[PDB]
């Protein structure tokens, strides 16, 4: 039915590639944690590129929140592709807070431009979040490919493109409390 | 190069990666290697620390074939009910004095320390080509011979075993002494004929047993053989020979030289290699320099008897080495020196004009950043990902940071940080995960090597 | 000439071009190209440039065989999951100072830069005729001998491979001493 | 199992090896072994194991159509005494 407590993961791509439109990044990762201010609404936070980090773990506490808004500002976008390394850290921290106990909505930023193994394994790294009682969300930047984002998130809808009429902002908030009571 | 295959729509379930072999040497361990009773004995396990037998050693390129790939298992799709099957392209090569015109050696395949996975004879008078000195067998114009690949039984590697190649990355090369006939001349018609009543196998025990062998790797880094006619008191005839001096021998044996009254090498001085005997050649040698009241053999140098079955080991002192007597890798010092050169920066690659000497105790290096303030951003991070120095035929090795960063150059958002690009020695090189999942550089021993400003490139 | 056709009605669903060989001498490159550390040694990989071996060089008619043919591939009906099997008329011939007098080389027929498509080495005293001095083996006023064609394994060629000849048409031919 | 020819004497061999026979008890032969003759050029010089101790020692029936047979009455007896032996021609 409907549910209040949602846990927000914030997977971003800090890759060369979309090393020019990082700031749009952030500002999607800050005008949602701007909006999302529920004690109930723990956000996480993770950048991928030769590998992942865990920026900001799983928690309600603007304290640290903020402080991750300050450390994801000042980030510089280099190192490859590996999506799927991001999107992991993320299932780690959901299956380590109940697995399907937990209704989680995994936000992962990226061009799509994935390469060699990165796409067999994101795509199937990507279905390993939705086997744990979650949600996959795709906001890409730049040209990115629509086609792995699809095979990445739950549908062409969980697709939204951080440039447009807050399209992305919308779309997304207002699907995420279709769920809310 | 190696082929690893899952035994028989398969185009990508495969990884093929290169390698780099290197005759060996191996010596013998530290002093506390549990050795059967059977060791102090005449003869018997008394291998002198290393003796007659040449094998060589390749190492599988751990760096990366493909994207994220990981675990080999993964990669291909084997599982503990499957078997692997292994092929390669090698290529005999004659590092002696003399040539072989026919019957190739028998080389068996290691993998461990005694699991063979295979033996490799080709077809004996099947080949006319020549083995000459410092050629490759298969002409390095020509195409590599491949193992098990033009055979009615494979090479068979069931998980456990290819699970081990992945742990080590790393297989041994044996091989035997038997060489076709030899080529002997024929005053008459002045002709060079191959006699079938004179094989090295009768005529070449004699050299190993009325000889001394030194082992020096001035040329390159590459253990070369050389045996120098000795001489011993027991045998009256064999006392009919020169009196042999270790200096003399260096001379002719490889071709130190006298320049200005220093016993050097093309350039390096006979004190820049280290002397290594065998249990009975350091004695042999230690009682000359006894009745010769000195300290420092450098001296005494052209004052040391050579005695047949005499052996030596004459390998250059500035790098390190491994337990089979390889160019592992030296001292930070001679490293960075090596990289003092710089031809072009560039935000795509660094192009220099690295010693050979050197490169060759190199693994990979480790772009990174360093924020105005001290931050450690590091770009390939990954143990696979320091394949990326190349090398223009011009002799100058050219580094990329593109490589591992989306194609794309390298990203200055404040150009006043310090591109950091370390080296790091193969001795030091990891190949494989840790105890957990660590694909990182963070537990490295890299070495700086370069260190410019933003604005100090482009 | 060489005559490629769909591994076994089928009668134009084969192509015939003629083609240009050459002795060659291939020298290094410019200067850029990767090559493994093993070149500046000593005799490793120094091949100076060039040195002894025989290796010829052959260029398919790129030029018209029918009408307004198109793409080997539609011509003949070559799709993912066939073989085509390729045929060729060749002719040894002596360039040196001194003659042959049995044995010919032992000549492998490369595609690309490793991909061996066979290799031919007719049968050894079964000929008596001489390979004199500028004189082409097969007496230019006989029959060129003719690949795989008079055998049990024939010269097997996959759809990415018959691609690639395409690509070049141009196959290499290596002969030993 | 992996065996290792060696000489004792005085003098060299330089090529066929002995055909050796492992026996198991009094009498019952478990198998003769006697590697192929030519085959090897090596040489079994004096106080100097064959398959020189800095290589790969030489293993019985895994290199061959027909192994060791041992039934569990004779697989007791090497239990009982846990020895086996060699005998060698010349
Ligand atoms: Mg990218």
């Known amino acids: 039915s409907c549910r209040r407590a949602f846990d927000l993961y914030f997977v971003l791509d800090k890759s060369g590639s979309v090393a020019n439109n990082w700031i749009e990044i952030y500002n999607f990762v800050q005008q949602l944690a701007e909006r999302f201010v529920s004690p109930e609404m723990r956000l996480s936070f993770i950048v991928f590129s030769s590998q992942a980090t865990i920026i900001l773990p799983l928690t309600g506490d603007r304290g640290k929140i903020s402080k991750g808004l300050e450390d994801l500002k000042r980030v510089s976008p280099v190192g490859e592709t590996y999506i799927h390394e991001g999107l992991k850290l993320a299932n780690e921290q959901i299956q380590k807070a109940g697995g399907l106990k937990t209704s989680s909505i995994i936000i992962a930023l990226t061009d799509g431009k994935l390469d060699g193994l990165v796409p067999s394994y994101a795509e199937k790294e990507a279905k390993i979040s939705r086997s744990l009682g979650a949600s996959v969300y795709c906001v890409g930047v730049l040209d990115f490919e629509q086609a792995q984002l699809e095979r990445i998130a739950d549908s062409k809808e969980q697709v939204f493109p951080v440039k447009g009429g807050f399209q992305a902002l919308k779309g997304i908030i207002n699907s995420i409390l279709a769920q809310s009571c | ?458």
């Open chain 2, 1 to 458: 190069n190696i082929i690893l295959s899952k035994n028989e729509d398969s185009q990508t379930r495969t990884i093929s990666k290169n390698t780099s072999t290197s005759r060996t040497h191996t010596s013998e361990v530290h002093g506390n290697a549990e050795v059967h009773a059977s060791f102090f004995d005449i003869g018997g396990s008394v291998s002198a620390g290393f003796s007659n037998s040449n094998s060589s050693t390749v190492a599988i390129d751990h760096s990366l074939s493909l994207a994220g790939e990981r675990t080999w298992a993964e990669t291909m799709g084997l599982n503990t009910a499957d078997t692997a099957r292994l092929n390669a392209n090698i290529r005999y090569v004659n590092t002696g004095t003399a040539p072989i015109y026919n019957v190739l050696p028998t080389t068996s395949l290691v993998l461990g320390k005694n699991q063979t996975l295979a033996t490799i004879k080709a077809k004996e008078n099947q080949l006319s080509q020549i083995l000459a000195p410092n050629n490759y067998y298969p002409s390095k114009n020509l195409a590599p011979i491949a193992l098990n690949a033009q055979s009615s039984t494979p090479i068979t590697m069931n998980y456990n075993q290819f699970l081990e190649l992945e742990k080590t990355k790393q297989l041994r090369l044996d091989t035997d002494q038997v060489y076709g006939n030899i080529a002997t001349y024929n005053f008459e018609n002045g002709r060079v004929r191959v006699d079938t009543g004179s094989n090295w196998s009768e005529v070449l025990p004699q050299i190993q047993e009325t000889t001394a062998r030194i082992i020096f790797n001035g040329k390159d880094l590459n253990l070369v053989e050389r045996r120098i006619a000795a001489v011993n008191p027991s045998d009256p005839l064999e006392t009919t020979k020169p009196d042999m001096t270790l200096k003399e021998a260096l001379k002719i044996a490889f071709g130190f030289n006298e320049p200005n009254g220093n016993l050097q090498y093309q350039g390096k001085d006979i004190t820049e290699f280290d002397f290594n005997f065998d249990q009975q050649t350091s004695q042999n040698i230690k009682n000359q320099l006894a009745e010769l009241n000195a300290t420092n053999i450098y001296t005494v140098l052209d004052k040391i008897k050579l005695n047949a079955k005499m052996n030596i080991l004459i390998r250059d002192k500035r790098f390190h080495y491994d337990r089979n007597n390889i160019a592992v890798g030296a001292d930070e010092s001679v490293v960075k020196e090596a990289h003092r050169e710089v031809i072009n920066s560039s935000t795509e690659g660094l192009l220099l004009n690295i010693d050979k000497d050197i490169r060759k105790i190199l693994s990979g290096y480790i772009v990174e950043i360093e924020d105005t303030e001290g931050l450690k951003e590091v770009i390939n991070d990954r143990y696979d990902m320091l394949n990326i120095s190349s090398l223009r035929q011009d002799g100058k090795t050219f580094i990329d940071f593109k490589k591992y960063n989306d194609k794309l150059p390298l990203y200055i958002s404040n150009p006043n940080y310090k591109v950091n690009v370390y080296a790091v020695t193969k001795e030091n090189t990891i190949i494989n995960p840790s105890e957990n999942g660590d694909t990182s550089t963070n537990g490295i021993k890299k070495i700086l090597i370069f260190s410019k400003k933003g604005y100090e490139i482009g």
